[PDB]
Amino acid sequence: LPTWSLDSNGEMRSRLSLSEVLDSGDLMKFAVDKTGCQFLEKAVKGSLTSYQKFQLFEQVIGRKDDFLKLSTNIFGNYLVQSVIGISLATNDDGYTKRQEKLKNFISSQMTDMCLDKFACRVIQSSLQNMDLSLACKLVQALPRDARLIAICVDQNANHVIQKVVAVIPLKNWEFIVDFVATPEHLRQICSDKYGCRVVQTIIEKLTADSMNVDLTSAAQNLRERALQRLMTSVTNRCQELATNEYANYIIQHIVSNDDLAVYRECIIEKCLMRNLLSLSQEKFASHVVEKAFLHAPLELLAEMMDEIFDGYIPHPDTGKDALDIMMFHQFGNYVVQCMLTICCDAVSGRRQTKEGGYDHAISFQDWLKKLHSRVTKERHRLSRFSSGKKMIETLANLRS
RNA sequence: UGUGCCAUA
């Protein structure tokens, strides 16, 4: 802090004016100091004369290097965002030159700003507050090489991509969809803790749900094609995705979203069906198998049930079948609990049995009798386990 | 008896 702005206690003076700081030439010293930036943030929200704004514009967002210095500063980035807001609210003759400049500054340093913990915040507010036509040019400045992968999996930069998805029309970021759908890119991004959230955010935006009814038909068509291309890529790798520590959340999202019903069915047929016993025994994929049972169309649900009850040959020596392996497995037990719950819900009316013009009620009764007969026969062993006790309880509590 | 991310003074 400048000596002129300090007392004899070494602390920043009180009754300090915004014009004193703007005139001094010392703004950069205040903006990167906690207390100094704290004063500027208050001063900047008040009534500003034309000249005060003019000076903030020139000092905070008028020169590339000071702008970068502040944007990437722990305290400075807040002043930059405030001044960007004030710039956008000030429709004088210099409006367009200021906004074009800001667009140039950021564009030329897009990647580095995105990856910066503080500058990514400047990017994000610019994206949502700038005129749409200028915000779209910020998106064009995104990298198209390995740097985009790095952006998607970065703890800071992933929020930039998510913001783009939120406030920019699809045409401008359609390249990100195609980038992510590329087989090797999808693999890397989906199997990352930040990247899998980015991919789901993209999927949600590409879904024709209640939040997209404002779209024109041409825009819905554009959305559908992009969805279709991303989903094709996801389903081509559903096996790797469903079994992965992070990507399983994506597969669960698709499987349980009614507005993605056609893709849910594709996934079930592509990697789930015929692998139910195997997958039910995996730490990550068992959650996906539960989702499938819960949201499958009744025709596929019947196939899934039939696979568990009669899809596998028992062990040649002991007589242990798929249901046996599953009821006692550390992960598979949750899938059996899920099958039971579905049947009880159906038979007690808590779940719609009509679908495909016909009533599948007797199928549910059939599956329930199977489960009830097994649990009755194995009650002694099942009562050793929390999961077993839960099933026994469920069956008795349905009779009541 | 079984998994994540939701990030600045």
Side-chain angles (χ1 to χ4, degrees), chain A residues 227-284:
Chain A
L227 180 62
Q228 180 162 196
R229 302 192 307 269
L230 177 58
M231 292 291 107
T232 302
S233 206
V234 159
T235 68
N236 282 345
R237 298 182 82 91
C238 83
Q239 180 81 20
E240 174 194 303
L241 271 20
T243 59
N244 181 76
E245 60 182 344
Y246 296 122
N248 79 85
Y249 287 106
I250 301 174
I251 301 311
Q252 287 186 73
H253 181 267
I254 298 170
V255 169
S256 41
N257 196 332
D258 286 341
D259 290 319
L260 290 174
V262 74
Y263 301 104
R264 146 161 82 215
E265 302 192 4
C266 181
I267 282 171
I268 292 175
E269 298 183 285
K270 164 77 188 192
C271 62
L272 300 201
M273 211 64 80
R274 290 172 303 278
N275 307 110
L276 297 186
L277 175 53
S278 180
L279 295 181
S280 296
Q281 291 170 87
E282 299 209 27
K283 183 184 171 60
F284 308 115

Short mmCIF file of all heavy atoms in Angstrom, two decimals, chain A residues 227-284:
data_model
loop_
_atom_site.label_atom_id
_atom_site.label_comp_id
_atom_site.label_asym_id
_atom_site.label_seq_id
_atom_site.Cartn_x
_atom_site.Cartn_y
_atom_site.Cartn_z
N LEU A 227 -27.47 -34.83 -29.41
CA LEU A 227 -27.75 -35.85 -28.40
C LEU A 227 -27.45 -37.21 -29.00
O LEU A 227 -26.79 -38.06 -28.37
CB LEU A 227 -29.21 -35.80 -27.94
CG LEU A 227 -29.58 -36.84 -26.87
CD1 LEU A 227 -28.77 -36.65 -25.61
CD2 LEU A 227 -31.07 -36.77 -26.53
N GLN A 228 -27.93 -37.41 -30.22
CA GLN A 228 -27.83 -38.70 -30.87
C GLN A 228 -26.37 -39.11 -31.09
O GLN A 228 -26.01 -40.27 -30.88
CB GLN A 228 -28.60 -38.67 -32.20
CG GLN A 228 -28.56 -39.97 -32.97
CD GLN A 228 -29.67 -40.03 -34.00
OE1 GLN A 228 -30.00 -41.11 -34.53
NE2 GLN A 228 -30.27 -38.87 -34.30
N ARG A 229 -25.54 -38.15 -31.48
CA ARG A 229 -24.11 -38.40 -31.67
C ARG A 229 -23.39 -38.69 -30.36
O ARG A 229 -22.56 -39.59 -30.30
CB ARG A 229 -23.44 -37.23 -32.39
CG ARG A 229 -24.06 -36.93 -33.78
CD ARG A 229 -23.22 -35.96 -34.63
NE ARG A 229 -22.93 -34.71 -33.93
CZ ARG A 229 -23.69 -33.61 -33.98
NH1 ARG A 229 -24.80 -33.59 -34.71
NH2 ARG A 229 -23.33 -32.54 -33.29
N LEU A 230 -23.69 -37.92 -29.32
CA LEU A 230 -23.07 -38.20 -28.02
C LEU A 230 -23.50 -39.57 -27.47
O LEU A 230 -22.67 -40.34 -27.00
CB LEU A 230 -23.36 -37.09 -27.01
CG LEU A 230 -22.82 -37.30 -25.59
CD1 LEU A 230 -21.30 -37.49 -25.58
CD2 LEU A 230 -23.22 -36.12 -24.69
N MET A 231 -24.79 -39.87 -27.57
CA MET A 231 -25.32 -41.13 -27.06
C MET A 231 -24.78 -42.33 -27.82
O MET A 231 -24.53 -43.40 -27.26
CB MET A 231 -26.85 -41.13 -27.11
CG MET A 231 -27.51 -40.15 -26.13
SD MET A 231 -27.31 -40.66 -24.40
CE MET A 231 -26.12 -39.47 -23.81
N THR A 232 -24.59 -42.17 -29.12
CA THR A 232 -24.05 -43.28 -29.90
C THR A 232 -22.69 -43.62 -29.31
O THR A 232 -22.38 -44.78 -29.03
CB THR A 232 -23.86 -42.92 -31.36
OG1 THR A 232 -25.12 -42.51 -31.92
CG2 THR A 232 -23.32 -44.11 -32.13
N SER A 233 -21.89 -42.59 -29.10
CA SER A 233 -20.57 -42.78 -28.55
C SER A 233 -20.61 -43.38 -27.13
O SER A 233 -19.78 -44.22 -26.78
CB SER A 233 -19.82 -41.45 -28.56
OG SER A 233 -18.43 -41.68 -28.61
N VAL A 234 -21.57 -42.96 -26.31
CA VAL A 234 -21.66 -43.46 -24.95
C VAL A 234 -22.04 -44.93 -24.93
O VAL A 234 -21.50 -45.72 -24.14
CB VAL A 234 -22.66 -42.68 -24.09
CG1 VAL A 234 -23.11 -43.52 -22.90
CG2 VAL A 234 -22.04 -41.38 -23.63
N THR A 235 -22.95 -45.30 -25.82
CA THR A 235 -23.45 -46.68 -25.85
C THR A 235 -22.42 -47.65 -26.45
O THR A 235 -22.39 -48.82 -26.08
CB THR A 235 -24.79 -46.79 -26.61
OG1 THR A 235 -24.58 -46.51 -28.00
CG2 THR A 235 -25.78 -45.79 -26.07
N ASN A 236 -21.57 -47.16 -27.36
CA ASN A 236 -20.46 -47.95 -27.90
C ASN A 236 -19.44 -48.36 -26.84
O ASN A 236 -18.65 -49.28 -27.04
CB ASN A 236 -19.74 -47.18 -29.01
CG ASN A 236 -20.49 -47.22 -30.31
OD1 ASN A 236 -21.40 -48.02 -30.48
ND2 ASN A 236 -20.12 -46.34 -31.24
N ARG A 237 -19.44 -47.65 -25.71
CA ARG A 237 -18.51 -47.95 -24.64
C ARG A 237 -19.23 -48.17 -23.32
O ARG A 237 -18.62 -48.01 -22.25
CB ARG A 237 -17.50 -46.81 -24.46
CG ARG A 237 -16.63 -46.54 -25.67
CD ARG A 237 -15.63 -45.42 -25.40
NE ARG A 237 -14.43 -45.88 -24.69
CZ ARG A 237 -13.31 -46.30 -25.30
NH1 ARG A 237 -13.24 -46.35 -26.62
NH2 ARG A 237 -12.27 -46.68 -24.57
N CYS A 238 -20.52 -48.51 -23.37
CA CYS A 238 -21.28 -48.55 -22.12
C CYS A 238 -20.69 -49.52 -21.10
O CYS A 238 -20.77 -49.28 -19.90
CB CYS A 238 -22.80 -48.75 -22.34
SG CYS A 238 -23.41 -50.41 -22.57
N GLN A 239 -20.04 -50.58 -21.58
CA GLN A 239 -19.40 -51.58 -20.72
C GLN A 239 -18.31 -50.95 -19.85
O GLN A 239 -18.34 -51.05 -18.62
CB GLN A 239 -18.82 -52.72 -21.57
CG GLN A 239 -18.15 -53.83 -20.78
CD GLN A 239 -19.13 -54.84 -20.22
OE1 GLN A 239 -20.27 -54.96 -20.69
NE2 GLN A 239 -18.69 -55.59 -19.21
N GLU A 240 -17.35 -50.28 -20.49
CA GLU A 240 -16.29 -49.58 -19.78
C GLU A 240 -16.85 -48.44 -18.91
O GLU A 240 -16.41 -48.22 -17.77
CB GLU A 240 -15.28 -49.02 -20.79
CG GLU A 240 -14.21 -48.14 -20.17
CD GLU A 240 -13.45 -47.32 -21.20
OE1 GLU A 240 -12.86 -47.92 -22.13
OE2 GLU A 240 -13.46 -46.07 -21.09
N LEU A 241 -17.82 -47.71 -19.43
CA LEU A 241 -18.40 -46.58 -18.72
C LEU A 241 -19.16 -47.06 -17.47
O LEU A 241 -18.93 -46.57 -16.36
CB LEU A 241 -19.30 -45.78 -19.65
CG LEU A 241 -18.65 -44.64 -20.46
CD1 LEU A 241 -17.14 -44.79 -20.58
CD2 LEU A 241 -19.30 -44.49 -21.84
N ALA A 242 -20.06 -48.01 -17.65
CA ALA A 242 -20.88 -48.52 -16.55
C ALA A 242 -20.07 -49.12 -15.41
O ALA A 242 -20.52 -49.10 -14.27
CB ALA A 242 -21.86 -49.55 -17.07
N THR A 243 -18.88 -49.65 -15.69
CA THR A 243 -18.07 -50.32 -14.66
C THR A 243 -17.03 -49.40 -14.02
O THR A 243 -16.39 -49.76 -13.03
CB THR A 243 -17.36 -51.59 -15.20
OG1 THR A 243 -16.52 -51.24 -16.30
CG2 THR A 243 -18.39 -52.61 -15.67
N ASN A 244 -16.89 -48.21 -14.58
CA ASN A 244 -15.93 -47.23 -14.10
C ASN A 244 -16.38 -46.47 -12.85
O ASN A 244 -17.56 -46.18 -12.68
CB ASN A 244 -15.61 -46.24 -15.20
CG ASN A 244 -14.60 -45.21 -14.77
OD1 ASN A 244 -13.40 -45.50 -14.69
ND2 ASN A 244 -15.06 -44.01 -14.48
N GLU A 245 -15.42 -46.13 -12.00
CA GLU A 245 -15.67 -45.43 -10.74
C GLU A 245 -16.42 -44.10 -10.86
O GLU A 245 -17.14 -43.71 -9.94
CB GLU A 245 -14.34 -45.19 -10.01
CG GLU A 245 -13.36 -44.34 -10.79
CD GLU A 245 -12.02 -44.15 -10.07
OE1 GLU A 245 -11.97 -44.41 -8.85
OE2 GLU A 245 -11.03 -43.73 -10.72
N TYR A 246 -16.24 -43.39 -11.97
CA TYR A 246 -16.92 -42.10 -12.16
C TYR A 246 -17.99 -42.17 -13.23
O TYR A 246 -19.10 -41.62 -13.08
CB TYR A 246 -15.91 -41.00 -12.50
CG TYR A 246 -14.93 -40.73 -11.37
CD1 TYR A 246 -13.56 -40.85 -11.56
CD2 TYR A 246 -15.39 -40.34 -10.12
CE1 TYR A 246 -12.67 -40.60 -10.52
CE2 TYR A 246 -14.51 -40.09 -9.08
CZ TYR A 246 -13.15 -40.21 -9.29
OH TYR A 246 -12.29 -39.96 -8.24
N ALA A 247 -17.69 -42.87 -14.32
CA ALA A 247 -18.60 -42.90 -15.46
C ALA A 247 -19.92 -43.63 -15.15
O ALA A 247 -20.92 -43.39 -15.80
CB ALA A 247 -17.93 -43.50 -16.67
N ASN A 248 -19.92 -44.53 -14.18
CA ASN A 248 -21.17 -45.19 -13.84
C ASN A 248 -22.29 -44.18 -13.49
O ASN A 248 -23.45 -44.46 -13.70
CB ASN A 248 -20.96 -46.21 -12.71
CG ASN A 248 -20.89 -45.55 -11.36
OD1 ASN A 248 -21.92 -45.30 -10.73
ND2 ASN A 248 -19.66 -45.24 -10.90
N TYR A 249 -21.93 -43.01 -12.97
CA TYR A 249 -22.93 -41.99 -12.67
C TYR A 249 -23.63 -41.47 -13.93
O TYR A 249 -24.82 -41.17 -13.93
CB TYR A 249 -22.31 -40.83 -11.89
CG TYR A 249 -22.00 -41.20 -10.46
CD1 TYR A 249 -20.69 -41.42 -10.05
CD2 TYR A 249 -23.01 -41.35 -9.53
CE1 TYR A 249 -20.40 -41.78 -8.75
CE2 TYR A 249 -22.72 -41.69 -8.21
CZ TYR A 249 -21.42 -41.91 -7.83
OH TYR A 249 -21.12 -42.27 -6.53
N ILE A 250 -22.87 -41.37 -15.02
CA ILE A 250 -23.43 -40.98 -16.30
C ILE A 250 -24.43 -42.02 -16.80
O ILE A 250 -25.56 -41.67 -17.19
CB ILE A 250 -22.33 -40.74 -17.35
CG1 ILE A 250 -21.38 -39.65 -16.85
CG2 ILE A 250 -22.95 -40.36 -18.69
CD1 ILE A 250 -20.18 -39.44 -17.74
N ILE A 251 -24.03 -43.29 -16.76
CA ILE A 251 -24.90 -44.37 -17.24
C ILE A 251 -26.17 -44.45 -16.40
O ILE A 251 -27.27 -44.64 -16.92
CB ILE A 251 -24.16 -45.72 -17.25
CG1 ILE A 251 -22.93 -45.63 -18.15
CG2 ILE A 251 -25.08 -46.85 -17.70
CD1 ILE A 251 -23.21 -45.03 -19.52
N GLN A 252 -26.03 -44.30 -15.08
CA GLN A 252 -27.21 -44.18 -14.21
C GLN A 252 -28.09 -43.00 -14.59
O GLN A 252 -29.31 -43.13 -14.62
CB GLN A 252 -26.79 -44.03 -12.75
CG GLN A 252 -26.27 -45.30 -12.11
CD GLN A 252 -26.03 -45.09 -10.65
OE1 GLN A 252 -26.97 -45.00 -9.87
NE2 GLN A 252 -24.77 -44.95 -10.28
N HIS A 253 -27.49 -41.84 -14.88
CA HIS A 253 -28.32 -40.71 -15.26
C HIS A 253 -29.15 -41.01 -16.51
O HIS A 253 -30.32 -40.67 -16.58
CB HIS A 253 -27.52 -39.44 -15.51
CG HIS A 253 -28.38 -38.29 -15.88
ND1 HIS A 253 -28.65 -37.96 -17.20
CD2 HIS A 253 -29.10 -37.43 -15.12
CE1 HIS A 253 -29.48 -36.93 -17.22
NE2 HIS A 253 -29.77 -36.59 -15.98
N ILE A 254 -28.54 -41.64 -17.50
CA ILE A 254 -29.25 -41.93 -18.74
C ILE A 254 -30.34 -42.96 -18.49
O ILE A 254 -31.48 -42.80 -18.93
CB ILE A 254 -28.30 -42.44 -19.83
CG1 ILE A 254 -27.26 -41.35 -20.18
CG2 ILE A 254 -29.12 -42.87 -21.07
CD1 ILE A 254 -26.10 -41.84 -21.09
N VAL A 255 -29.99 -44.01 -17.76
CA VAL A 255 -30.95 -45.09 -17.51
C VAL A 255 -32.19 -44.64 -16.72
O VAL A 255 -33.28 -45.15 -16.93
CB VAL A 255 -30.26 -46.31 -16.84
CG1 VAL A 255 -31.29 -47.30 -16.33
CG2 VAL A 255 -29.32 -46.97 -17.83
N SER A 256 -32.05 -43.66 -15.82
CA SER A 256 -33.20 -43.27 -15.01
C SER A 256 -33.95 -42.02 -15.48
O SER A 256 -34.89 -41.57 -14.82
CB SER A 256 -32.79 -43.09 -13.54
OG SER A 256 -31.54 -42.46 -13.47
N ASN A 257 -33.54 -41.46 -16.61
CA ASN A 257 -34.23 -40.30 -17.13
C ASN A 257 -35.26 -40.73 -18.18
O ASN A 257 -34.87 -41.21 -19.24
CB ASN A 257 -33.24 -39.29 -17.71
CG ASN A 257 -33.86 -37.93 -17.92
OD1 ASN A 257 -35.06 -37.80 -18.13
ND2 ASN A 257 -33.04 -36.90 -17.87
N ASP A 258 -36.55 -40.57 -17.87
CA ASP A 258 -37.61 -40.91 -18.81
C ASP A 258 -37.44 -40.20 -20.15
O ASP A 258 -37.77 -40.75 -21.20
CB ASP A 258 -39.00 -40.58 -18.24
CG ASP A 258 -39.45 -41.57 -17.17
OD1 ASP A 258 -38.90 -42.68 -17.10
OD2 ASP A 258 -40.35 -41.22 -16.38
N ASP A 259 -36.92 -38.97 -20.11
CA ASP A 259 -36.79 -38.18 -21.33
C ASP A 259 -35.67 -38.71 -22.23
O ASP A 259 -35.47 -38.22 -23.34
CB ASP A 259 -36.61 -36.69 -21.01
CG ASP A 259 -37.89 -36.06 -20.45
OD1 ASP A 259 -39.00 -36.36 -20.95
OD2 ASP A 259 -37.78 -35.26 -19.50
N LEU A 260 -34.96 -39.72 -21.74
CA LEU A 260 -33.91 -40.41 -22.49
C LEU A 260 -34.29 -41.89 -22.69
O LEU A 260 -33.42 -42.76 -22.88
CB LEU A 260 -32.55 -40.27 -21.76
CG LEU A 260 -31.92 -38.86 -21.75
CD1 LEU A 260 -30.66 -38.78 -20.89
CD2 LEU A 260 -31.59 -38.33 -23.15
N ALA A 261 -35.59 -42.18 -22.62
CA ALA A 261 -36.07 -43.56 -22.67
C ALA A 261 -35.45 -44.40 -23.80
O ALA A 261 -35.00 -45.53 -23.58
CB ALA A 261 -37.57 -43.59 -22.74
N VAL A 262 -35.40 -43.85 -25.01
CA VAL A 262 -34.86 -44.63 -26.13
C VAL A 262 -33.39 -44.99 -25.90
O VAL A 262 -32.95 -46.09 -26.24
CB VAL A 262 -35.09 -43.92 -27.50
CG1 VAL A 262 -34.14 -42.75 -27.67
CG2 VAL A 262 -34.93 -44.91 -28.64
N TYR A 263 -32.64 -44.11 -25.25
CA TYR A 263 -31.23 -44.39 -24.98
C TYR A 263 -31.07 -45.33 -23.79
O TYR A 263 -30.13 -46.11 -23.72
CB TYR A 263 -30.44 -43.09 -24.82
CG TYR A 263 -30.56 -42.27 -26.08
CD1 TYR A 263 -31.40 -41.17 -26.14
CD2 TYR A 263 -29.89 -42.65 -27.25
CE1 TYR A 263 -31.54 -40.44 -27.32
CE2 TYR A 263 -30.01 -41.92 -28.43
CZ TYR A 263 -30.84 -40.83 -28.46
OH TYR A 263 -30.98 -40.11 -29.63
N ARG A 264 -32.02 -45.27 -22.86
CA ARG A 264 -32.05 -46.20 -21.75
C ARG A 264 -32.18 -47.64 -22.24
O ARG A 264 -31.49 -48.55 -21.76
CB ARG A 264 -33.20 -45.85 -20.82
CG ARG A 264 -33.85 -47.06 -20.16
CD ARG A 264 -34.63 -46.60 -18.95
NE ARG A 264 -35.95 -46.09 -19.31
CZ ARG A 264 -36.57 -45.09 -18.69
NH1 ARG A 264 -35.99 -44.42 -17.70
NH2 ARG A 264 -37.79 -44.74 -19.08
N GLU A 265 -33.09 -47.85 -23.21
CA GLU A 265 -33.34 -49.19 -23.74
C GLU A 265 -32.12 -49.71 -24.50
O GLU A 265 -31.71 -50.86 -24.35
CB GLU A 265 -34.57 -49.19 -24.63
CG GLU A 265 -35.80 -48.71 -23.88
CD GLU A 265 -37.09 -48.95 -24.63
OE1 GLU A 265 -37.04 -49.58 -25.72
OE2 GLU A 265 -38.15 -48.52 -24.12
N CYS A 266 -31.52 -48.83 -25.29
CA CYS A 266 -30.31 -49.16 -26.01
C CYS A 266 -29.22 -49.63 -25.05
O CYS A 266 -28.57 -50.66 -25.29
CB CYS A 266 -29.85 -47.96 -26.85
SG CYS A 266 -28.36 -48.24 -27.83
N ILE A 267 -29.02 -48.90 -23.96
CA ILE A 267 -27.97 -49.25 -23.01
C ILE A 267 -28.20 -50.61 -22.36
O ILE A 267 -27.28 -51.41 -22.23
CB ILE A 267 -27.83 -48.20 -21.91
CG1 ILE A 267 -27.07 -46.99 -22.44
CG2 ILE A 267 -27.13 -48.81 -20.68
CD1 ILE A 267 -27.07 -45.81 -21.50
N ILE A 268 -29.43 -50.85 -21.96
CA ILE A 268 -29.79 -52.10 -21.32
C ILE A 268 -29.48 -53.28 -22.24
O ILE A 268 -28.87 -54.27 -21.81
CB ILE A 268 -31.27 -52.08 -20.94
CG1 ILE A 268 -31.50 -51.07 -19.83
CG2 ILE A 268 -31.72 -53.46 -20.50
CD1 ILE A 268 -32.95 -50.88 -19.46
N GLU A 269 -29.86 -53.15 -23.51
CA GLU A 269 -29.63 -54.19 -24.52
C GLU A 269 -28.16 -54.34 -24.90
O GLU A 269 -27.68 -55.44 -25.16
CB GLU A 269 -30.48 -53.93 -25.77
CG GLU A 269 -32.00 -53.97 -25.52
CD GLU A 269 -32.83 -53.77 -26.79
OE1 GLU A 269 -32.92 -52.62 -27.28
OE2 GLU A 269 -33.40 -54.77 -27.29
N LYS A 270 -27.43 -53.22 -24.90
CA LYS A 270 -26.05 -53.18 -25.36
C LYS A 270 -25.05 -53.80 -24.40
O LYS A 270 -24.21 -54.60 -24.81
CB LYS A 270 -25.62 -51.74 -25.66
CG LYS A 270 -24.10 -51.54 -25.79
CD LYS A 270 -23.58 -52.04 -27.13
CE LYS A 270 -22.06 -52.01 -27.18
NZ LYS A 270 -21.57 -52.21 -28.58
N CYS A 271 -25.11 -53.43 -23.12
CA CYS A 271 -24.14 -53.99 -22.18
C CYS A 271 -24.74 -54.68 -20.95
O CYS A 271 -24.06 -55.48 -20.31
CB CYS A 271 -23.10 -52.93 -21.74
SG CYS A 271 -23.81 -51.51 -20.89
N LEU A 272 -26.00 -54.38 -20.62
CA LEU A 272 -26.58 -54.92 -19.38
C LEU A 272 -27.12 -56.34 -19.56
O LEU A 272 -26.73 -57.27 -18.84
CB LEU A 272 -27.66 -54.01 -18.83
CG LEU A 272 -27.23 -52.58 -18.47
CD1 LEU A 272 -28.23 -52.01 -17.50
CD2 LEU A 272 -25.84 -52.56 -17.86
N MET A 273 -28.02 -56.50 -20.52
CA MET A 273 -28.70 -57.75 -20.76
C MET A 273 -27.67 -58.85 -21.06
O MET A 273 -26.70 -58.63 -21.79
CB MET A 273 -29.69 -57.58 -21.93
CG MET A 273 -30.92 -58.47 -21.84
SD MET A 273 -31.97 -58.11 -20.41
CE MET A 273 -32.87 -56.68 -21.00
N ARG A 274 -27.87 -60.01 -20.45
CA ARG A 274 -26.93 -61.14 -20.54
C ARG A 274 -25.70 -61.01 -19.64
O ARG A 274 -25.00 -61.99 -19.43
CB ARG A 274 -26.51 -61.44 -21.98
CG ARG A 274 -27.61 -62.02 -22.85
CD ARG A 274 -27.21 -62.12 -24.31
NE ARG A 274 -26.81 -60.82 -24.83
CZ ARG A 274 -27.66 -59.89 -25.26
NH1 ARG A 274 -28.96 -60.14 -25.22
NH2 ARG A 274 -27.20 -58.73 -25.71
N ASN A 275 -25.44 -59.82 -19.11
CA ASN A 275 -24.34 -59.65 -18.16
C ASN A 275 -24.81 -59.27 -16.75
O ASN A 275 -24.02 -58.78 -15.94
CB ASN A 275 -23.36 -58.58 -18.65
CG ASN A 275 -22.88 -58.84 -20.06
OD1 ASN A 275 -23.23 -58.12 -20.99
ND2 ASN A 275 -22.09 -59.90 -20.24
N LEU A 276 -26.08 -59.50 -16.45
CA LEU A 276 -26.65 -59.04 -15.19
C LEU A 276 -25.97 -59.66 -13.96
O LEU A 276 -25.72 -58.97 -12.98
CB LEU A 276 -28.16 -59.27 -15.14
CG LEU A 276 -28.99 -58.52 -16.18
CD1 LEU A 276 -30.50 -58.70 -15.96
CD2 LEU A 276 -28.65 -57.04 -16.22
N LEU A 277 -25.68 -60.96 -14.01
CA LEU A 277 -25.06 -61.64 -12.87
C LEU A 277 -23.66 -61.10 -12.62
O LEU A 277 -23.28 -60.84 -11.49
CB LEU A 277 -25.00 -63.15 -13.11
CG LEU A 277 -24.26 -63.96 -12.03
CD1 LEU A 277 -24.84 -63.64 -10.66
CD2 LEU A 277 -24.30 -65.47 -12.35
N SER A 278 -22.89 -60.96 -13.68
CA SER A 278 -21.53 -60.44 -13.60
C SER A 278 -21.54 -59.01 -13.05
O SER A 278 -20.84 -58.71 -12.08
CB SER A 278 -20.90 -60.47 -15.00
OG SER A 278 -19.59 -59.96 -14.98
N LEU A 279 -22.32 -58.14 -13.68
CA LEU A 279 -22.39 -56.72 -13.32
C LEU A 279 -22.93 -56.49 -11.91
O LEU A 279 -22.52 -55.56 -11.21
CB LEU A 279 -23.26 -55.97 -14.32
CG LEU A 279 -22.73 -55.90 -15.75
CD1 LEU A 279 -23.71 -55.11 -16.59
CD2 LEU A 279 -21.36 -55.24 -15.76
N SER A 280 -23.86 -57.34 -11.49
CA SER A 280 -24.46 -57.19 -10.17
C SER A 280 -23.39 -57.44 -9.11
O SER A 280 -23.56 -57.05 -7.97
CB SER A 280 -25.60 -58.19 -9.97
OG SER A 280 -26.68 -57.96 -10.86
N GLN A 281 -22.29 -58.08 -9.50
CA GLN A 281 -21.22 -58.36 -8.55
C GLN A 281 -20.11 -57.31 -8.56
O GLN A 281 -19.11 -57.44 -7.85
CB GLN A 281 -20.62 -59.75 -8.82
CG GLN A 281 -21.57 -60.89 -8.48
CD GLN A 281 -21.06 -62.21 -8.98
OE1 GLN A 281 -20.29 -62.89 -8.30
NE2 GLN A 281 -21.46 -62.57 -10.19
N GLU A 282 -20.27 -56.27 -9.36
CA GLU A 282 -19.24 -55.24 -9.40
C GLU A 282 -19.61 -54.06 -8.54
O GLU A 282 -20.78 -53.71 -8.42
CB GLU A 282 -18.99 -54.79 -10.83
CG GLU A 282 -18.51 -55.94 -11.69
CD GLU A 282 -17.63 -55.47 -12.81
OE1 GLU A 282 -16.99 -54.41 -12.65
OE2 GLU A 282 -17.60 -56.16 -13.85
N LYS A 283 -18.59 -53.46 -7.93
CA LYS A 283 -18.80 -52.35 -7.01
C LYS A 283 -19.54 -51.19 -7.68
O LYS A 283 -20.51 -50.68 -7.15
CB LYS A 283 -17.46 -51.88 -6.44
CG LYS A 283 -17.56 -50.76 -5.41
CD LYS A 283 -16.17 -50.29 -4.98
CE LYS A 283 -16.24 -49.04 -4.11
NZ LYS A 283 -17.04 -49.28 -2.88
N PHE A 284 -19.08 -50.77 -8.86
CA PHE A 284 -19.67 -49.61 -9.50
C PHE A 284 -20.89 -49.97 -10.36
O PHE A 284 -21.93 -49.30 -10.28
CB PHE A 284 -18.59 -48.83 -10.28
CG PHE A 284 -17.37 -48.49 -9.45
CD1 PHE A 284 -16.13 -49.02 -9.75
CD2 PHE A 284 -17.48 -47.65 -8.35
CE1 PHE A 284 -15.01 -48.71 -8.99
CE2 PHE A 284 -16.37 -47.34 -7.57
CZ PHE A 284 -15.14 -47.87 -7.90
#
